[PDB]
């Protein structure tokens, strides 16, 4: 339930071939970038870096929670349906 990860803006690459070695069974790769994750503090700056290095960027906008009204006392209500059968 931690929220010190949903603070940054991260740049990753699409994935690529990731097969199994025949000798023992490890996982190899033809691409070096697969594990190149980069940090940023702003979408504008990230976009600047991306379009600067020339790649083709695609965004995933921010999914932010909503605010809610937790009138605890409601659990112990009279007319409502919220009334729980537990404690």
- Judged by the rule CB under 8 A, the positions of this chain that interact with other proteins are 1-4, 15, 18-20, 26-27, 35, 60, 63-73, 75-87
The C-alpha angle 54, 59, 61, rounded to 5 degrees, equals 155
Tell the smallest beta-carbon distance from residue 55 to other proteins (Å): 18
Shortest Cβ 59–other proteins spacing (Å): 13
Cα separation values, 85 from 78, 79, 82, Å: 12, 14, 9
Token pair recorded at residue 55:
């790649």
Q: How far is the CB of 52 from other proteins (least distance, A)?
A: 25
């Amino acid at each position: 339930s931690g929220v010190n990860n949903t603070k940054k803006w991260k740049m990753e690459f699409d994935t690529r071939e990731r097969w199994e070695n025949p000798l023992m069974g490890w996982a190899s790769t033809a691409d070096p970038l697969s594990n190149m994750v980069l940090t940023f503090s702003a979408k504008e700056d990230a976009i600047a870096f991306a379009e600067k290095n020339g790649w083709s960027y695609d965004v995933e906008e921010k999914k932010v929670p909503k605010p809610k009204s937790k009138s605890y006392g409601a659990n112990f209500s009279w007319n409502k349906r919220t009334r729980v059968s537990t404690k």
